[PDB]
Design a binder for this molecule. Sequence first.
Ligand code: ACO
Ligand code: ACO
Ligand code: ACO
Ligand code: TYD
Ligand code: TYD
Ligand code: TYD
Lengths: 141, 141, 141
Amino acid sequence: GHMIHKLADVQSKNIGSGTRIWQFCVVLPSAIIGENCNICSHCFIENDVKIGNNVTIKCGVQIWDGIEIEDDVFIGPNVTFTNDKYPRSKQFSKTIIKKGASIGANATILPGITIGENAMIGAGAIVTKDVLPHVTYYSKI
Amino acid sequence: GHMIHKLADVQSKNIGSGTRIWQFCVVLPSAIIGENCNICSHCFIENDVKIGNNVTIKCGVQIWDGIEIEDDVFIGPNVTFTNDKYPRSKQFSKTIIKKGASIGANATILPGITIGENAMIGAGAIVTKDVLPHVTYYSKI
Amino acid sequence: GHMIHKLADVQSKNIGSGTRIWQFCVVLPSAIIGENCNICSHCFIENDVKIGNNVTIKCGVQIWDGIEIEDDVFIGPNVTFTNDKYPRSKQFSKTIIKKGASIGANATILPGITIGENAMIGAGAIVTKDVLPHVTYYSKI
Ligand SMILES: CC(=O)SCCNC(=O)CCNC(=O)[C@H](O)C(C)(C)COP(=O)(O)OP(=O)(O)OC[C@H]1O[C@@H](n2cnc3c(N)ncnc32)[C@H](O)[C@@H]1OP(=O)(O)O
Ligand SMILES: CC(=O)SCCNC(=O)CCNC(=O)[C@H](O)C(C)(C)COP(=O)(O)OP(=O)(O)OC[C@H]1O[C@@H](n2cnc3c(N)ncnc32)[C@H](O)[C@@H]1OP(=O)(O)O
Ligand SMILES: CC(=O)SCCNC(=O)CCNC(=O)[C@H](O)C(C)(C)COP(=O)(O)OP(=O)(O)OC[C@H]1O[C@@H](n2cnc3c(N)ncnc32)[C@H](O)[C@@H]1OP(=O)(O)O
Ligand SMILES: Cc1cn([C@H]2C[C@H](O)[C@@H](COP(=O)(O)OP(=O)(O)O)O2)c(=O)[nH]c1=O
Ligand SMILES: Cc1cn([C@H]2C[C@H](O)[C@@H](COP(=O)(O)OP(=O)(O)O)O2)c(=O)[nH]c1=O
Ligand SMILES: Cc1cn([C@H]2C[C@H](O)[C@@H](COP(=O)(O)OP(=O)(O)O)O2)c(=O)[nH]c1=O
C-alpha cells in the first residue's frame, strides 16, 4: 500500500505502492503517482499530472495541470513550475521533467519546458529554455 | 457567500461573495478580501492587508501588513512580498500591486514597491524598483 | 512554556520558553529550538537541527538535517536551505547561520555554507559561497 499522512488532503486513488505523502499536501483526484515516491510536506499536486516511480518531491512544490515527472526525478524544495506564460486574472503549456533529472531547490521553471534525462538544474535557477539531457544548468549571479 | 476550506484558518469576516480560500491558508482578522478572489492552498494573509475584486493568489503566497492588491491582479505561486528592508530579529514599508498587474511565479518583491496597472513581472524576477504601468520586467539570468 | 498551534505537528520536546510555532508547521523529534523564537506558518524543521534563542523564522522555511541557526538570526519568508550539492532520487553538508545574521526573503543557500555574524543577505539572492561577518551580499539582476 501507500502512506497518506492524516494531515494531508489526498483525493487521488491512483497512487503506487511504497509512496509516502506527508503533512499539509493537497492531491487532486486525477493525479497519477507511481511507486516508491516521497511527496514531502506542503506540496500541491493538480489533476492533469503524471508522476513516475521513485520520484522525490521535497517540501513546498506545486505541480500543475499539464506537467509530467518521469521516473527517478529529484525535485528540490520550493521548486516552482508554471503552465501559463502570460497570466491574467480570470483569463496552457506542458512541462516534462525526464527520467533521472534533478531540479535544484527554489528553481523556477517557465511554461512548456523539457528538462532532459539526468540533467542537473542549479538551486535558484530560472529555466526559460529546454535543458539538454545530462546537462548542468544554473543562472548567473 | 464565500467558500472557506475546512482545512484553512480564516479569522477575517471581511471577505467578498464568490471568494474561495483553500487548504492550509491563514487569514488574520483585519484582512479585507474582495469578491470572486481565489486564494489557493498554503497562503498567509496578515492584518493590514487589502485585496480587491477578481484577484488570483496562487499557492504559497504570503501577503504581509502594509500590502495592497488592487482589482484583477494575478499573483503567481510562491511570489514573495516584503515590508522591512533591513530586517533584524526582535527589531515598515508599503507595497501596492495596481489593477490588473500580474506577478510571475516565485518572483521576489522588495519593500515599498509599486507595480503599475497591467504590468507583467517575469517568473523568478527580483523587483528592487517600481515597475511602470503595462511594462514587462524580468531579471537577467 | 512555549506555544504550539493546534494546527502544527510538533514532535520535539526540546523547545525553549517563549517560543511560538504557528499553523501548518512540522517539527521532527530531535530538533532543538531555543527561547523566544517565532516559527511562522508553513515551516518544516528536521531532526539534526539546532536553532538558538531569539530567532525569527518567517513563513515557508524548511531547515534540514545538518543546519544550525545561531542566536538572534532573522530568516526571511521562503528562504531555502540545502544539504546535498548533487541530489539524485534514492541516492551531506552542514550550513551554519551565525549570530544576528539576516537572510532576505526567498534567498537560496547552497550546501556547506557559513553566513557570518550580522551579515545581511539580499532578498532573492543565491548564496554559493560563504558570506563574511557583517557583509551585505545580494545577487546581480
Ligand atoms: C500555475 C501557473 O502557471 S500560474 C502562472 C505563472 N506564470 C508565470 O510565472 C509566467 C510568467 N511569464 C514570464 O516570465 C515570461 O517569460 C515573460 C512574460 C516575462 C516574457 O515572455 P516574452 O516576453 O515572450 O519573452 P521571451 O519568451 O521572448 O523571452 C525573451 C528573452 O527574455 C528571457 N526571459 C523571458 N522570461 C524570463 C524570466 N522570467 N526571467 C529571466 N529571463 C527571461 C528569455 O530567456 C529570452 O532571452 P533571449 O532573448 O536571450 O532568448
Ligand atoms: C515580511 C518581511 O518583510 S520579512 C523581512 C524580509 N526583508 C527582506 O528580504 C529585505 C532584504 N533587503 C534587501 O534585499 C536590501 O535590498 C539590501 C539589504 C540587500 C540592500 O539594501 P541597500 O544596501 O539599501 O541597497 P540599495 O537599495 O541602495 O540598492 C543598491 C543596488 O543594489 C540593488 N539591490 C538591492 N537589493 C537587491 C537584491 N536583494 N537583489 C538584487 N539587487 C539588489 C539595487 O537594485 C541597487 O541597484 P542600483 O545601484 O543599480 O540602483
Ligand atoms: C534538502 C535538500 O538539500 S534537497 C537537495 C537540494 N540541492 C540543491 O538544490 C543543490 C543543487 N546544486 C547546485 O546548485 C550546484 O551548485 C551545481 C550542481 C549547480 C553546480 O555545482 P558544481 O558544478 O560543483 O559547480 P561549482 O560549485 O564548481 O561552481 C562553479 C561556479 O558556478 C557557480 N554556481 C554553482 N552553482 C550555482 C547556482 N545554483 N546558481 C548560481 N551560480 C552557481 C559558482 O558560484 C561557481 O562560480 P565561480 O566559478 O565564479 O566560483
Ligand atoms: C518524517 C517526515 C518526513 N517528511 C519528508 C521530508 C524529509 O526530508 C523526508 C525524509 O525522507 P527520506 O528519509 O529522505 O527518504 P527519501 O529516500 O525519499 O529521501 O520526508 C515530511 O515531509 N514529514 C515528516 O513528518
Ligand atoms: C480544488 C482546489 C483548487 N485549489 C486552487 C489551486 C488551483 O490551481 C486553483 C483552481 O482554480 P481555477 O479553476 O484556476 O480558478 P481561477 O479562475 O481562480 O484560476 O484553485 C486549491 O488550492 N485547492 C483545491 O483543493
Ligand atoms: C498570529 C499569527 C502570526 N504568525 C506569524 C507570522 C506573522 O508575521 C508573525 C507575527 O509575529 P510578530 O508580532 O512579528 O513577532 P516577532 O517579534 O517574532 O516578529 O507571526 C503566524 O504564522 N500565524 C498566526 O496566526
